[PDB]
């Protein structure tokens, strides 16, 4: 086992600056107002967005100014090789919920749907590294499929640091090694970050590198996603007339 | 259970009963006291205090200068408030008590259905209570009974609202206060004291406003050093 | 009997069977619409740093000076004359709360609903109590919008007796961006039935009567020869929508006429669906031009 | 005398009609409770069968009633109460009533004031008018001079005496509270 | 660790599993037999209605906390809490449960909703609380019957009573359907079944079953057998309710 | 939910032997079955029955056997009723239906003759296999139980447990020996694993694959569990309504026939797919 | 007008039921009603009712005291007792009563935990004593303690042995052994009205409208295990010595009753 | 209960005073409040109060069977509780979002940064290992928690001492604080968080925000650091759009701030040891 061969290659067979082929789709479930699917390698996220609809049991939380974003996270038991139970209610899925919520409340441009729930839901079927970013991106595609206004593709990805270099879009192996991994989600058009999570020890001068690397990886993810979205829109319009 | 007259400047503690001299002369039970038969039960620690009316028939009055933070809706008290919402005709304002008080859209000076007042949620007010009781939610108003707002109504904007202890107010509003007089000499200002420990201030600039709020929230125990320190700072603003 | 299982086949995208190469201007969020001197914005965009930036995925439309976007999936925004079909959800002391494919809870005020026959005097408490026994929670109403509030909600009414409460019939829920904005949503087809095409995505299908306002429930049976037609229409509509094409009189009539050979059930199997839709589409396109 | 059971038939429709606590199936009536049945007879000779669980047989406070109650909650608008004695027969099924602002005195003056008429934790007696529809909110009225408060406890723990029409006082010490005294 | 109960040991296994013996087998008996039944309604005081049923080692209570404010939407509700006391059964289980208690609760609700008529109890939820003090055989059926008694006692309206009956299957070479069995005949069994009906109008209300095996015809015979058992049991419950009503008449 | 007149329409349709989908009372709809969707599992499957989409994962882990049955292993079931089905589910509102479905799945497998667990024992009282099944709901369009069962069976059929030799040694040292032959992994028979069948009663006629709109129109529903032979493992009843004693028998007979047909079709399909091989490309969610 | 209606009787030196302010109500028990359990006891004071089932299991002790067999009580006030309880987790009253029972078990020392160790460091008994209320008409602590003691006398345990070859223990469910208990703690309740009025065995309403409550456990050899005094209008030793006397009397009575029962079997 | 609403007056005044770079109490933007570190009598207790925000920290130990994946190194169990005395809104089981984010952040910061030696605290590899839990309790809530919680956890885990243990084969012998002298822990580096608050979408940034400043802020940047300039965690919350240079500058600030806080902590521990070496069960340090 190893992470960076002296030549520059990884285990999976890709250099540091590149990533794995995302293969996506938009329109999985029709009984909803917006759905998506994404596989950013072996990972397999699945998003759903029940649109801006009425609040029931008002319970005096229907914001009158803006809309009410309610995003729920879930990591299936059979996601990891080690089976686990209680995927919801845990102290980690709820943190992921907070994160997704504060991202999309930033992006989703709620000032136009006051007193209304935008219900986002995310289920992770398979996890092999980069488990948050796949979900961010799937929920983005979902939102778009639901014609919900939103400032920009909020594209996310992860970076890491090994042997004085920066890796893009980590997997589980180098994610388990314990090295610093920095996940983020930004809005490309403006160059602004909507989220910045990070967990491990490393020096400071080695920050700009992984930071810009994650940013560029997110730009690439943006390219791929937007090509998908354009194919989808084109096909739909053609079928309309 | 002895000598109400000998402990008029001492520290009384709850439980203590004290009795008063006489056929008799009507008197009044202060806020921190309570009546048990012909005796006065104490309900709050305090430096006891007494007063008598200019006449000789009124008898007297007793109370305890208790310091604390929480407010209780009382009647005939000028109070700052923060509009919390509006339900149809009446809009509910917070006071700092058990429950939120209520106003009426036609209580402000010169208002009717065809002339409604400009009150927006979050707006702050300077009113007084007309029904303050333990059994019913308190209703307040921003107009004297005659029909003129003698300084009441919405406060305004461009000021600082902070909160202090109630005894601090009960002291500052005294006609023999030194701090609030000395402040009238350094730089101008205009301020509202609300008997719920909540104070509003305005001046020309902002540095001055901040220095002023710090003074007020500290003036209970300021040292001459810090006193002249902040005075010099104001002189240099 | 008959049961059948089958593996899932992979889609065939790009809709190359048509070969159009549209002449439209598609966009996606972050995309920058033409930035010029004072161009007004509409639904489906916003502004940033003196730059008109899209907000939703679809085609852009530039009316004389107004720049708007026409997304491909939304929830019914309220217009002012659009007819509508609605399923009731609540009965408040003053009114009824109705569910359309809208971003809020549509509202039918007690003042709006027509009365039995033409017995119009005024609304009192007795009407406030019949407010329930007549329009039960869960029922359906075929109305038209009255107005749209600033909070987004839609107040709707019942102009005449052609509107009101609905019989037994059947219903479908499609997307609202798949019904051509035109007139006379109320159709009565020669097939032996009638259809209502909401400006929202709620289609209603009821057998057509012979007399020609819902104040009585004709809970009578329905001839097989008038339920088979309704079911075939239902499945034909599902076909049309599953292939993402518009929906109106001629489309449904021609899918009907196409689905006579193929029986009343075997026209949801994606192959039959696709061939019927292709036949219908081709014949519309060639006949109209 | 016979005690019945929620499944046993009782009679044909041709030999009686359902009054309460029953139901009907093909050409027969069927009980619905564990209790005692009774077939009353009108001058018409057609009996009305019914079933009753006489534990709490039945009560009904009608319009022209005189019912006591206890003042729990109050407001500048109305004061809510709980029904204890319908006449003189108590009822463990404490119903919940209301007293309006104007419906407090026969004079109907708007000058009336709840906090000077009622207080939470005192017993009154009044006349119901409206049964209610959704929550069976009884609306009680005291538009009479022999109505209203009868017993009322003092500032803390003393029971007061109804001196006058709108005054009450405690016998131990002296303090004039204000209510809508009865009689 | 639960912080609402006393600090006990982490784990604790019973001694039986550490035993060494072939437990006694019942043997033979009259398949169409019924155990002696003691059913009485009106036991408990603080409850609007209560009932108690004993059949062999089976000992069940049921109470009915009556209407508590909470057309087809303004239709009543009844929520049932089945609960076996931790001192019933060879093994001990913490009070909460969460596996089979809820299944049997669903069963009770599905078997009671039909009998009870809830149009006359709108905006209301009836809290039914069953308690199984000792397990000695057919348990869910006893619970159905006891809840029915408690309801009929509190005076909630109905259409008919609910009578249950539990059956088992003998794993012998000639498998016969064993009626109203014991915990031994039920743990040494291949298949189990439970019927519950309303005998006047002859309608099932909720049934249940399971099997190491079986077949259509066998299950059908089981069904009809359980129906006959419930019919033969009904009169006991009738007399019990009559008796309780007489005691009420006596009290006043 | 829905109105009353629609219910009249539907019930008279059934009584007439037609339905809004123009099908009779003994006719399912095209059920898209797939297997080997997810990779990290020792087995997986997916079903799309009309508008209900189910996923199923199966993990063969190593665990201690059960004291009362050390000679063989056990199946466990978990059921994530993801809110993605209908938003009225959340971290607490779906637990009810999940628990119900899991209790059913257990009741289907306290049979001792369905999955030969003896084949899952390595060393009695010391080590054993454990089949953690994980059902995952993604839509609710009715006939839920039948689809869940079909998925369980397709997943079992698609399960590949590895061979392991657990060798003991003194001074408490244990060793596991794998077989480096992912092609030599064992396979458990499913010739007895049963399918569920949900007969909902509408009017005076019973119906299979009761779509939602028809479930709301019903009063009772008999769940049967059949094997390809014709036996009836489980026989449960669900509904806030009553049910006659005679109709039970018709329901059971119909369940028997439908189970025969269903198992035949499923067996044929999955043999087909196992024949094809990696050439199928495993189209899933794409 | 409940309180007044009640003071009338109180001043007539009586109660609205027919009790002379100092006497309890009909106390009854039933032993061995339950087979699935090792020990079983039903207690009822007129309308009040309680049932204890004590199960016996094996467990590994702590590290501070290997020779200690755990005794774990838990009280259950299900919603069928009274409407003041709701389906769900345990409230406050159940938990308080549980801690009271445990404090008793631990202080009275009715039982020697050491008398429950089979193989120290490896095994020891655990007695799960589960109490259940069925009618909370009042005075639930007395009933709980009395039922606990009754069942905990009924309990007879099996005998176990150890085999060094197998290194495991075997049971002999045929032979058995009773459980030795040294002290017989009985609990006596009191309700204190405004200042000086102490009534004994207070029912429901009497506890609802009372200024304070009191409970006192009185071992046989003139000692006390617990003086549960949660709040109240106050007391002086003079209003307390009398309660202690009455507690001794109640001890005598209920012990005679329990003896008669265990001898009538 | 509920938190009193915020008046528009205070909001506008605060935003303006920020525009003009004026805090309320009188400090700059790149400044903390006087933080005091007070110790208890029992090794492992620390009350740290920055301005008005007081937080308590206790550290306890146990011996338990480890988890199979790591049978060599021990365990560590964080928990932070928001006592109702901190503020009214902190009812039990209601403000769960704040609990979750704080606890996850703190776990991450301390655990995954490898601040202590989970290996040193092994006794019997496979059977018995230590288990160090740390319970933080929030007493007064005025503004910045994470900083206080972290300083408390660190002062504790550096002012805690285990009951010494001897071992031979499987024979394990625990002992009492009176029979031997408890042994301290093994820290490698003390991280302490640093909280930045963003105003007006990113234009302005503050340090150690008070409660009002937390109510009129849109975004929060937490940054964990050491005296050796080693990022351990950084987190963005509040749904805010920042940039690169902002985080770079915030990091160059956190460097100095953490250096100074660390100097203080070390001085505090030194003073506490000196006191106990002279008679006295306390220890006090002031910024």
From Swiss-Prot, chain A:
GO CC aspect terms: cytoplasm; cytoplasmic exosome (RNase complex); cytosol; euchromatin; exosome (RNase complex); intracellular membrane-bounded organelle; nuclear exosome (RNase complex); nucleolar exosome (RNase complex)
Main location (coarse class): cytoplasm
GO function terms (MF aspect): 3'-5'-RNA exonuclease activity; mRNA 3'-UTR AU-rich region binding; RNA binding
One Pfam family here: RNase_PH
UniProt-annotated location(s): Cytoplasm; Nucleus, Nucleolus; Nucleus; Nucleus, Nucleoplasm
Signal peptide span: none
Keywords for this protein: Acetylation, Cytoplasm, Exosome, Nucleus, RNA-binding, rRNA processing
Biological processes annotated in GO: defense response to virus; DNA deamination; histone mRNA catabolic process; maturation of 5.8S rRNA; nuclear mRNA surveillance; nuclear-transcribed mRNA catabolic process; poly(A)-dependent snoRNA 3'-end processing; positive regulation of cell growth
Family in the record: Belongs to the RNase PH family.
Listed PANTHER family: EXOSOME COMPLEX COMPONENT, EXOSOME COMPLEX COMPONENT RRP41
Quaternary structure and interacting proteins, as annotated: Component of the RNA exosome core complex (Exo-9), composed of EXOSC1, EXOSC2, EXOSC3, EXOSC4, EXOSC5, EXOSC6, EXOSC7, EXOSC8 and EXOSC9; within the complex interacts with EXOSC2, EXOSC7 and EXOSC9. The catalytically inactive RNA exosome core complex (Exo-9) associates with the catalytic subunit EXOSC10/RRP6. Exo-9 may associate with DIS3 to form the nucleolar exosome complex, or DIS3L to form the cytoplasmic exosome complex.
Protein name from the UniProt record: Exosome complex component RRP41
Swiss-Prot record, chain C:
Protein's cellular compartments: Cytoplasm; Nucleus, Nucleolus; Nucleus
Keywords associated with the record: Cytoplasm, Deafness, Disease variant, Dwarfism, Exosome, Nucleus, Phosphoprotein, Retinitis pigmentosa, RNA-binding, rRNA processing
Organism: Homo sapiens
This protein's encoding gene: EXOSC2
Gene Ontology molecular function: 3'-5'-RNA exonuclease activity; 7S RNA binding; RNA binding
Keyword Nucleus in record: yes
Domain S1 motif: 79-159
Protein name in UniProt: Exosome complex component RRP4
GO CC annotations, alphabetized: cytoplasm; cytoplasmic exosome (RNase complex); cytosol; exosome (RNase complex); nuclear exosome (RNase complex); nucleolar exosome (RNase complex); nucleolus; nucleoplasm
Predominant location category: cytoplasm
PANTHER family per record: EXOSOME COMPLEX COMPONENT RRP4, PNAS-3 RELATED
UniProtKB/Swiss-Prot annotation, chain D:
Phenotype when changing residue 31 to L: In PCH1F; decreased protein abundance
Domain of life: Eukaryota
A Pfam family this chain is assigned to: ECR1_N
Molecular function terms from GO: RNA binding
Localization (cell): Nucleus, Nucleolus; Nucleus; Cytoplasm
Subunit structure: Component of the RNA exosome core complex (Exo-9), composed of EXOSC1, EXOSC2, EXOSC3, EXOSC4, EXOSC5, EXOSC6, EXOSC7, EXOSC8 and EXOSC9; within the complex interacts with EXOSC6. The catalytically inactive RNA exosome core complex (Exo-9) associates with the catalytic subunit EXOSC10/RRP6. Exo-9 may associate with DIS3 to form the nucleolar exosome complex, or DIS3L to form the cytoplasmic exosome complex. Exo-9 is formed by a hexameric base ring consisting of the heterodimers EXOSC4-EXOSC9, EXOSC5-EXOSC8 and EXOSC6-EXOSC7, and a cap ring consisting of EXOSC1, EXOSC2 and EXOSC3.
UniProt disease link: Pontocerebellar hypoplasia 1F: A form of pontocerebellar hypoplasia, a disorder characterized by structural defects of the pons and cerebellum, evident upon brain imaging. PCH1F is an autosomal recessive form characterized by hypotonia, global developmental delay, poor overall growth, and dysmorphic facial features. Brain imaging shows pontocerebellar hypoplasia, thin corpus callosum, cerebral atrophy, and delayed myelination.
Classification lineage: Eukaryota, Metazoa, Chordata, Craniata, Vertebrata
UniProt xrefs under Gene3D superfamilies: 2.40.50.100, Nucleic acid-binding proteins
Protein name: Exosome complex component CSL4
Residues where Phosphoserine is found: 17, 94
Curated annotation (Swiss-Prot), chain H:
Location in the cell: Cytoplasm; Nucleus; Nucleus, Nucleolus; Nucleus, Nucleoplasm
Any one GO molecular-function label of the UniProt entry: RNA binding
Keywords noted in UniProt: Acetylation, Cytoplasm, Disease variant, Exosome, Isopeptide bond, Neurodegeneration, Nucleus, Phosphoprotein, RNA-binding, rRNA processing, Ubl conjugation
Domain of life: Eukaryota
Annotated segments matching region ARE binding: 1-268
Effect of residue 14 to P: In PCH1D; reduced EXOSC9 and exosome levels in patient cells
Keyword Nucleus: yes
Major site of localization recorded for this protein: cytoplasm
Job of this protein: Non-catalytic component of the RNA exosome complex which has 3'->5' exoribonuclease activity and participates in a multitude of cellular RNA processing and degradation events. In the nucleus, the RNA exosome complex is involved in proper maturation of stable RNA species such as rRNA, snRNA and snoRNA, in the elimination of RNA processing by-products and non-coding 'pervasive' transcripts, such as antisense RNA species and promoter-upstream transcripts (PROMPTs), and of mRNAs with processing defects, thereby limiting or excluding their export to the cytoplasm.
Protein name: Exosome complex component RRP45
Species lineage: Eukaryota, Metazoa, Chordata, Craniata, Vertebrata
Parent sequence residues shown: 1 to 287 of 439
């Amino acid at each position: 086992l190893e992470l960076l061969s002296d030549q520059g290659y990884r285990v999976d067979g890709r250099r540091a600056g590149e990533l794995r082929k995302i293969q996506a789709r938009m329109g999985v479930f029709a009984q909803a107002d917006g759905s998506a699917y994404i596989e950013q390698g072996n990972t397999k996220a699945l998003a759903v967005v029940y649109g801006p609809h009425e609040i029931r049991g008002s319970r005096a939380r229907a914001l009158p100014d803006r809309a009410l974003v309610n995003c729920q996270y879930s990591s299936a038991t059979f996601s990891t090789g080690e089976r686990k139970r209680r995927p919801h209610g845990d102290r980690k899925s709820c943190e992921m919920g907070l994160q997704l919520r504060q991202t999309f409340e930033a992006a989703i441009l709620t000032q136009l749907h006051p007193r209304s729930q935008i219900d986002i839901y995310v289920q992770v079927l398979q996890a092999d590294g980069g488990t948050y970013a796949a979900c961010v991106n799937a929920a983005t595609l979902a939102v778009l499929d639901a014609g919900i206004p939103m400032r920009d593709f909020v594209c996310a990805c992860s970076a890491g640091f090994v042997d004085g270099t920066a890796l893009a879009d980590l997997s589980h192996v180098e994610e388990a090694a314990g090295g610093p991994q920095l996940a983020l989600a930004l809005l490309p058009a403006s160059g602004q970050i909507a989220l910045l999570e990070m967990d491990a020890r490393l020096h400071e001068d080695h920050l700009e590198r992984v930071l810009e690397a994650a940013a560029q990886a997110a730009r690439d993810v943006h390219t791929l996603l937007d090509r998908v979205v354009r194919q989808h829109v084109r096909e739909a319009s053609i079928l309309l007339g | 259970a002895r000598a109400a007259r000998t402990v008029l400047g001492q520290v009384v503690l709850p439980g203590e009963e004290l009795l008063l001299p006489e056929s008799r002369v009507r008197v009044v039970c202060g806020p921190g006291l309570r009546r048990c038969g012909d005796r006065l039960l104490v309900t709050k620690c305090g430096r006891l205090r007494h007063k008598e009316p200019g006449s000789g028939s009124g008898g007297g009055v007793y109370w305890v200068d208790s310091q604390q933070k929480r407010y209780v809706p009382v009647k005939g008290d000028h109070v700052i408030g923060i509009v919390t919402a509006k339900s149809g005709d009446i809009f509910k304002v917070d006071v700092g008590g058990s429950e939120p008080a209520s106003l009426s859209y036609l209580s402000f000076e010169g208002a009717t259905k065809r002339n409604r007042p400009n009150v927006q949620v979050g707006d702050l007010i300077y009113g007084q209570f007309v029904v303050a009781n333990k059994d019913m939610e308190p209703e307040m108003v921003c107009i004297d009974s005659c029909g003129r707002a003698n300084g009441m109504g919405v406060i305004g904007q461009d000021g600082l609202l902070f909160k202090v202890t109630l005894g601090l107010i009960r002291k500052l509003l005294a006609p023999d206060c030194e701090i609030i007089q000395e402040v009238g000499k350094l730089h101008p200002l205009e301020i509202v004291f609300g008997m719920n420990g909540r104070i509003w201030v305005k001046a020309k600039t902002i540095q001055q406003t901040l220095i002023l709020a710090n003074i007020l929230e500290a003036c209970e125990h300021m040292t001459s050093d810090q006193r002249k320190q902040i005075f010099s700072r104001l002189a240099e603003s | 009997m008959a049961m059948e299982m089958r593996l899932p086949v992979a889609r065939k995208p790009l809709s190359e069977r048509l070969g159009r190469d549209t002449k439209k201007h598609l966009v996606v969020p972050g995309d920058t619409i033409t930035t010029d001197t004072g161009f007004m914005r509409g639904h489906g965009t916003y502004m940033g740093e003196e730059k008109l930036i899209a907000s939703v995925a679809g085609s852009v439309e530039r009316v004389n000076k107004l720049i708007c976007v026409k997304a491909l999936k939304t929830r019914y925004i309220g217009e002012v004359g659009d007819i509508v079909v609605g399923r009731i959800t609540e009965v408040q002391q003053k009114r009824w709360k109705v569910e359309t494919n809208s971003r809020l809870d549509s509202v039918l005020l007690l003042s709006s609903m027509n009365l039995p026959g033409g017995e119009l005097r005024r609304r009192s408490a007795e009407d406030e109590l019949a407010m329930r026994g007549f329009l039960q929670e869960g029922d359906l109403i075929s109305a038209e919008v009255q107005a749209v509030f600033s909070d987004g909600a839609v107040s709707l009414h019942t102009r005449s007796l052609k509107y009101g409460k609905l019989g037994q019939g059947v219903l479908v829920q499609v997307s609202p961006s798949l019904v051509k904005r035109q007139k006379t949503h109320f159709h009565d087809l020669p097939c032996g039935a009638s259809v209502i095409l909401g400006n929202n995505g709620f289609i209603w299908i009821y057998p057509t009567p012979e007399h020609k306002g819902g104040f009585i429930a004709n809970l009578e049976p329905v001839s097989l020869a008038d339920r088979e037609v309704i079911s075939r229409l239902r499945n034909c509509i599902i076909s049309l929508v599953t292939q993402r094409m518009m929906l109106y009189d001629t489309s449904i009539l021609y899918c009907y006429e196409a689905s006579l050979p193929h029986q009343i059930k075997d026209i949801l199997k994606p192959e039959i669906m696709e061939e019927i839709v292709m036949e219908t589409r081709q014949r519309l396109l060639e006949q109209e031009g | 005398v016979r005690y019945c059971i929620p499944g046993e038939r009782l009679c044909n429709l041709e030999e009686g009609s359902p009054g309460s606590g029953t139901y009907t199936r093909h050409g027969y009536i069927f009980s619905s409770l564990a209790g005692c049945l009774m077939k009353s007879s009108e001058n018409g000779a057609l009996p009305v069968v019914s079933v009753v669980r006489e534990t709490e047989s039945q009560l009904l406070p009608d319009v022209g009633a005189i019912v006591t109650c206890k003042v729990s909650s109050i407001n500048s608008r109305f004061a809510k109460v709980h029904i204890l004695y319908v006449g003189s027969m108590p009822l463990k099924n404490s119903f919940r009533g209301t007293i309006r602002k104007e419906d407090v005195r026969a004079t109907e003056k708007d000058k009336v004031e709840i906090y000077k008429s009622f207080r939470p934790g005192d017993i009154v007696l009044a006349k119901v008018i409206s049964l209610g529809d959704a929550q069976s909110n009884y609306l009680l009225t005291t538009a009479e001079n022999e109505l209203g408060v009868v017993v009322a406890h003092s500032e803390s723990g003393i029971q007061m005496v109804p001196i006058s029409w709108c005054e009450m006082q405690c016998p131990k010490t002296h303090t004039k509270e204000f209510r809508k005294v009865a009689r | 660790g639960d912080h609402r109960r006393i600090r006990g040991p982490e784990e604790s296994q019973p001694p039986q599993l550490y035993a060494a013996d072939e437990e006694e087998a019942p043997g033979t008996r009259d398949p169409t037999r019924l155990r002696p039944v003691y059913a009485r309604a009106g036991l408990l005081s603080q409850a609007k209605g209560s009932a108690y049923l004993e059949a062999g080692g089976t000992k069940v209570l049921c109470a009915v906390s009556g209407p508590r404010q909470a057309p087809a939407a303004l239709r009543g509700r009844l929520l049932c809490d089945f609960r076996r006391a931790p001192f019933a059964g060879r093994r001990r289980r913490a009070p909460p449960g969460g596996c089979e208690e809820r299944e049997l609760a669903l069963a009770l609700q599905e078997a009671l909703e039909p009998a009870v008529r809830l149009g006359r109890y709108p905006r209301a939820q009836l809290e039914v609380s069953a308690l199984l003090l000792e397990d000695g055989g057919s348990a869910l059926a006893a619970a159905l019957t006891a809840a029915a008694l408690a309801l009929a006692d509190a005076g909630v309206e109905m259409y008919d009573l609910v009578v249950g009956c539990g059956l088992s299957l003998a794993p012998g070479p000639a498998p016969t359907w064993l009626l109203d069995p014991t915990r031994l005949e039920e743990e040494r069994a291949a298949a189990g079944l439970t019927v519950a009906l309303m005998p006047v109008l002859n309608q099932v209300a909720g049934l249940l079953g399971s099997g190491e095996g079986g077949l259509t015809e066998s299950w059908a015979e089981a069904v009809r057998l359980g129906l006959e058992g419930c019919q033969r049991l009904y009169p006991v419950l009738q007399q019990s309710l009559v008796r309780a009503a007489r005691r009420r008449g006596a009290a006043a | 939910t829905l109105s009353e007149a629609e219910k009249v329409y539907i019930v008279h349709g059934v009584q007439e032997d037609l339905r809004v989908d123009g099908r009779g009372c003994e006719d399912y709809r095209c059920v898209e079955v797939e297997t080997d969707v997810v990779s990290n599992t020792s087995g997986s499957a997916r079903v799309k029955l009309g508008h209900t989409d189910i996923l199923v994962g199966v993990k063969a882990e190593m665990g201690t056997p059960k004291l009362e049955k050390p000679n063989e292993g056990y199946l466990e079931f978990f059921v994530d009723c993801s809110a993605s089905a209908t938003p009225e589910f959340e971290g607490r509102g779906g637990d009810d239906l999940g628990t119900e479905i899991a209790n059913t799945l257990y009741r289907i497998f306290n049979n001792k003759s369905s999955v030969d667990l003896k084949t899952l024992c390595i060393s009695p009282r010391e080590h054993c296999w454990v089949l953690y099944v994980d059902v995952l709901l993604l839509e609710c369009g009715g006939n839920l139980f039948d689809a869940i069962s079909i998925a369980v069976k397709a997943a079992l059929f698609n399960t590949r447990i590895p061979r392991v030799r657990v060798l003991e040694d003194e001074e408490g040292s244990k060793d596991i020996e794998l077989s480096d032959d992912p092609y030599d992994c064992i396979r458990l028979s499913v010739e007895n694993v049963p399918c569920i069948v949900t007969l909902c009663k509408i009017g005076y006629r019973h119906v299979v694959d009761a779509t939602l709109q028809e479930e709301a129109c019903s009063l009772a529903s008999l769940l049967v569990s059949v094997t390809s032979k014709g036996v009836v493992t489980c026989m449960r009843k669900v509904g806030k309504g009553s049910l006659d004693p005679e109709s039970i028998f018709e329901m059971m007979e119909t369940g028997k026939r439908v189970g025969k047909v269903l198992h035949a079709s499923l067996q044929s399909v999955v043999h087909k797919e196992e024949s094809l091989g990696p050439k199928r490309q495993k189209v899933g969610f794409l | 007008e409940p309180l007044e209606y009640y003071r009338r009787f109180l001043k007539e030196n009586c109660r609205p039921d027919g009790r002379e302010l100092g006497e309890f109500r009909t106390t009854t028990v039933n032993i061995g009603s339950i087979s699935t359990a090792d020990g079983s006891a039903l207690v009822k004071l007129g309308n009040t009712t309680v049932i204890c089932g004590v199960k016996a299991e094996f467990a590994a002790p702590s590290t501070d005291a290997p020779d200690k067999g755990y005794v774990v009580p838990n009280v259950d006030l299900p919603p069928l007792c009274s409407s003041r309880f709701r389906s769900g987790p345990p409230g406050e009253e159940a938990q308080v009563a549980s801690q009271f029972i445990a404090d008793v078990i631990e202080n009275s020392q009715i039982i020697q935990k050491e008398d429950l160790c089979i193989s120290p460091g490896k095994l020891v008994w655990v007695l799960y004593c589960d109490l259940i209320c069925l009618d909370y008409d009042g005075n639930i602590l007395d009933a709980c303690t009395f039922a606990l003691l009754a069942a905990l006398k009924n309990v007879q345990l099996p005998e176990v042995t150890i085999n060094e070859e197998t290194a495991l223990a075997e049971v002999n469910l045929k032979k058995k052994s009773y459980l030795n208990i040294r002290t017989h703690p009985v609990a006596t309740s009191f309700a204190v009205f405004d200042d000086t009025l102490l009534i004994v065995d207070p029912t429901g309403e009497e506890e609802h409208l009372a200024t304070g409550t009191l409970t006192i456990v009185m071992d046989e050899e003139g000692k006390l295990c617990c003086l549960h005094k949660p709040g109240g209008s106050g007391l002086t030793g003079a209003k307390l010595q009398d309660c202690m006397s009455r507690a001794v009397t109640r001890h005598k009575e209920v012990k005679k009753l329990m003896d008669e029962v265990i001898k009538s079997m | 209960m509920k938190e009193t609403p915020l008046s528009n007056c205070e909001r506008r005044f605060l935003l303006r005073a920020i525009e003009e770079k004026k805090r309320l109490d009188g400090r700059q933007t790149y400044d903390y409040r006087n933080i005091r570190i007070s110790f208890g009598t029992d090794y492992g207790c620390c009350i740290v109060e920055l301005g008005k925000t007081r937080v308590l920290g206790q550290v306890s130990c146990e011996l338990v069977s480890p988890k199979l994946n790591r049978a060599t190194e021990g365990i560590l169990f964080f928990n932070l509780e928001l006592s109702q005395m901190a503020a009214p809104a902190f009812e039990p089981g209601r403000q769960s979002d704040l609990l979750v984010k704080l606890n996850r952040l703190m776990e991450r910061c301390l655990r995954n940064s490898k601040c202590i030696d989970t290996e040193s605290l092994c006794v019997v590899a496979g059977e018995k290992v230590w288990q160090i839990r740390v319970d933080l309790h929030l007493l007064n809530h005025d503004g910045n928690i994470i900083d206080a919680a972290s300083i408390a956890a660190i002062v504790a885990l550096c002012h805690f001492r285990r009951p010494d243990v001897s071992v031979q084969g499987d024979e394990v012998t625990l002992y009492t604080p009176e029979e031997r002298d408890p042994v301290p822990l093994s820290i490698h580096h003390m991280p302490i968080c640093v909280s930045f608050a963003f105003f007006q979408q990113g234009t302005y940034l503050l340090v150690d925000p008070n409660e009002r400043e937390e109510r009129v802020m849109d975004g929060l940047l937490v940054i964990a650091m050491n005296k050796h300039r080693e990022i351990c965690t950084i987190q963005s919350s509040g749904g805010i759009m920042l940039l690169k240079d902002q985080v770079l500058r915030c990091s160059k600030i956190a460097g100095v701030k953490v250096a100074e806080i660390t100097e203080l902590i070390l001085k505090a521990l030194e003073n506490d040891q000196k006191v106990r070496k002279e008679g006295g069960k306390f220890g006090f340090a002031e910024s």
